[PDB]
Design an enzyme around this catalytic site. Structure first.
Site, PDB file in Angstrom:
ATOM      1  N   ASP A 279       0.606  -1.762  -0.008  1.00 46.95           N
ATOM      2  CA  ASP A 279      -0.017  -0.019   0.263  1.00 46.95           C
ATOM      3  C   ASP A 279       0.587   1.507  -0.198  1.00 46.95           C
ATOM      4  OD1 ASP A 279      -1.778   1.333  -0.006  1.00 46.95           O
ATOM      5  OD2 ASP A 279      -2.641   1.651   1.977  1.00 46.95           O
TER       6      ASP A 279
ATOM      7  N   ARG B  43      -0.196   9.064   0.706  1.00 48.65           N
ATOM      8  CA  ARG B  43      -0.826   9.354   1.741  1.00 48.65           C
ATOM      9  C   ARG B  43      -0.441   7.826   2.826  1.00 48.65           C
ATOM     10  NH1 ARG B  43      -2.902   4.730   0.024  1.00 48.65           N
ATOM     11  NH2 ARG B  43      -3.221   4.660  -2.122  1.00 48.65           N
ATOM     12  N   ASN B  44       0.813   7.159   2.853  1.00 48.68           N
ATOM     13  CA  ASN B  44       1.171   6.235   3.029  1.00 48.68           C
ATOM     14  C   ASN B  44       2.658   6.848   4.139  1.00 48.68           C
ATOM     15  OD1 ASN B  44      -1.205   4.706   4.268  1.00 48.68           O
ATOM     16  ND2 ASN B  44      -1.034   3.521   2.247  1.00 48.68           N
TER      17      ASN B  44
ATOM     18  N   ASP C 225       1.591   3.136   7.885  1.00 46.64           N
ATOM     19  CA  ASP C 225       1.028   2.691   7.892  1.00 46.64           C
ATOM     20  C   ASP C 225       1.494   0.648   7.708  1.00 46.64           C
ATOM     21  OD1 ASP C 225      -1.417   4.031   8.465  1.00 46.64           O
ATOM     22  OD2 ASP C 225      -0.367   5.485   6.948  1.00 46.64           O
TER      23      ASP C 225
END
Length: 301
Positions: free
Chosen positions: A161, A165-166, A179
């Site tokens: 992922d 955003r992570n 994350d």
């Protein structure tokens, strides 16, 4: 493990006492968990009466079983991954006799997408003009993240992922991959087998994951290329104007994103190499680190 009857075993080397943790203001609410700032007294052994600011991930009131399974999995993945400068640092956990708290180092400059958007070249009250990104800053960001992933891949773990955003950014502008709730250990197996419909954002997924249900380190390399594109668009969102329902067929036809405005052809070709249709023809993270270091050394002079 089915979480509705699974009792978290003791792990004293990571356990942190609840009475030494003071929860503070919220930092984020995703959908599976929420993260709050907190003061952890004595979590740094070298300053044992000292309170240090941390981030605490925990469940929400409406959490599902899968939310709890993901939180446990994220904690266990960070335990096994070990320490690296470009991986957000696991500090401890409150696991016994109460809600599960996963305590991680605090990154005061927040998530990478908003960090880049606030530092774009010239109404946004969140902009930071005194820290506007140079080309060298962007290459340095990319190089740090490649180093974190090179380390991750050397531990035989896949993130699955990877995305702006992570990524978190510290007070000293250090990039921290975060994350790990979807990350998996692929030691002693040749690839991770995906279910029919995964929980990975489609616009960062490698085609062999999308269409053949297989995930390897080279699938993370594909996602890293999308991450690079996010970086060199200063926090843009990928495949702009293309809904995920149309992207499947476009990817099968060889569609790839265009070159970002702030990018050299050299860096765009690196993105395109990460998006090779054949996973084994994409660079490894070791090779990306080597190439980015050479570019960064030339840029810094």
């Amino acid at each position: 493990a089915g979480v509705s009857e699974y009792e978290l075993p003791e792990d004293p080397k990571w356990e942190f006492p609840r009475d030494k943790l003071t929860l503070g203001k919220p930092l984020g609410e995703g959908a599976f968990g929420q993260v709050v700032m907190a003061e952890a007294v004595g979590i740094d052994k070298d300053k044992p009466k000292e309170a240090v600011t941390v981030a605490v991930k925990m469940l929400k009131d409406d959490a599902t079983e899968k939310d709890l399974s993901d939180l446990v999995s994220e904690m266990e993945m960070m335990k096994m991954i070990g320490k690296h400068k470009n991986i957000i640092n696991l500090l401890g956990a409150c696991t016994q006799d109460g809600p599960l708290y996963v305590i991680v180092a605090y990154a005061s400059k927040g998530n990478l997408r908003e960090y880049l958007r606030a530092r774009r070249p010239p109404y946004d009250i969140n902009r930071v003009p005194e820290e506007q990104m140079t080309f060298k800053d962007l290459v340095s960001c990319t190089y740090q993240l490649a180093r974190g992933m090179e380390y991750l891949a050397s531990q035989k773990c896949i993130h699955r992922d990877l995305a702006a955003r992570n990524v978190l950014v510290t007070e000293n502008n250090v990039m921290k991959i975060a994350d790990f709730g979807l990350a998996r250990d692929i030691n002693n197996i040749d690839y991770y087998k995906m279910t029919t419909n995964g929980r990975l954002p489609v616009k960062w997924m490698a085609p062999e994951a999308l269409f053949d249900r297989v995930y390897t380190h080279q699938s993370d390399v594909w996602s890293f290329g999308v991450l690079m594109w996010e970086i060199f668009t200063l926090g843009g969102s990928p495949y702009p104007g293309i809904p995920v329902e149309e992207l499947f067929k476009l990817l099968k036809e060889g569609h790839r994103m265009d070159k970002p405005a702030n990018c050299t052809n050299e860096l765009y070709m690196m993105m395109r190499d990460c998006w090779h249709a054949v996973p084994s023809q994409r660079p490894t993270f070791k090779q990306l680190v080597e190439d980015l270091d050479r570019i960064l050394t030339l840029t810094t002079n």
